[PDB]
Amino acid sequence: FSCDHSACAVRCLAQRRKGGKCKNGDCVCR
Numbered sequence: 001f002s003c004d005h006s007a008c009a010v011r012c013l014a015q016r017r018k019g020g021k022c023k024n025g026d027c028v029c030r
Contacts, residue, residue, distance in 0.1 A: 003026075008028075008029070012027070
């Protein structure tokens with residue numbers, strides 16, 4: 001397990017969230 005900024009970034013931009021960022025595991029989308 002490892003909160004990758006890339007994975008979240010893509011998973012965010014793909015969910016119509018203009019991407020996001022990881023926070024100690026919590027993938028925030030903004």
